[PDB]
Amino acid sequence: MGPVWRKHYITYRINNYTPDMNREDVDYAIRKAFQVWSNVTPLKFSKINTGMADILVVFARGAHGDDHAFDGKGGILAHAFGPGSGIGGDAHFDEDEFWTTHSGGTNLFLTAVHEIGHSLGLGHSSDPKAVMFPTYAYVDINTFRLSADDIRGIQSLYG
Ligand X SMILES: NC(=O)[C@H](CCC(=O)O)NC(=O)[C@H](CCC(=O)O)NC(=O)[C@H](Cc1cc(-c2ccc(-c3cccc(Cl)c3)cc2)no1)CP(=O)(O)c1ccc(Br)cc1
Query: Which stretch in 41-49, 63-71, 95-103, 137-145 sits in contact with Zn ion by CB under 5 A?
Result: 63-71
Interatomic CA distance for residues 28 and 13, integer angstroms:
13
Residue 94 CB burial class (10 angstroms; 0-12, 13-18, ≥19) = buried
Q: Is residue 155 within 8 Å of residue 40, measured between CB atoms?
A: yes
Q: Among 20, 30, 93, 118, which residue sits at the site for Ca ion (rule: CB under 5 A)?
A: 20
Partner that binds at residue 20, options Ca ion, Zn ion, ligand X, none, CB closer than 5 to 8 Å by kind: Ca ion
Residue 93 phi, psi dihedral angles, 5° rounding: -115, 135
Question: Residues 64 to 123: which contact Ca ion by CB under 5 A?
Answer: 71, 75-76, 88-90, 94-95
The answer to whether the annotation marks 90 as part of a ligand binding site is yes
Interatomic CA distance for residues 73 and 52, integer angstroms:
31
How many C-beta atoms lie closer than 10 Å to residue 155's C-beta?
12
Q: Binding site for Ca(2+): which residues?
A: 20, 54, 71-72, 74, 76, 86, 88, 90, 94-95, 97
Residue ranges binding ligand X (CB under 6 A): 68, 74-80, 106, 110-111, 114-115, 118, 129, 131, 133-137, 139, 144
Q: Binding site for Zn(2+): which residues?
A: 64, 66, 79, 92, 114, 118, 124
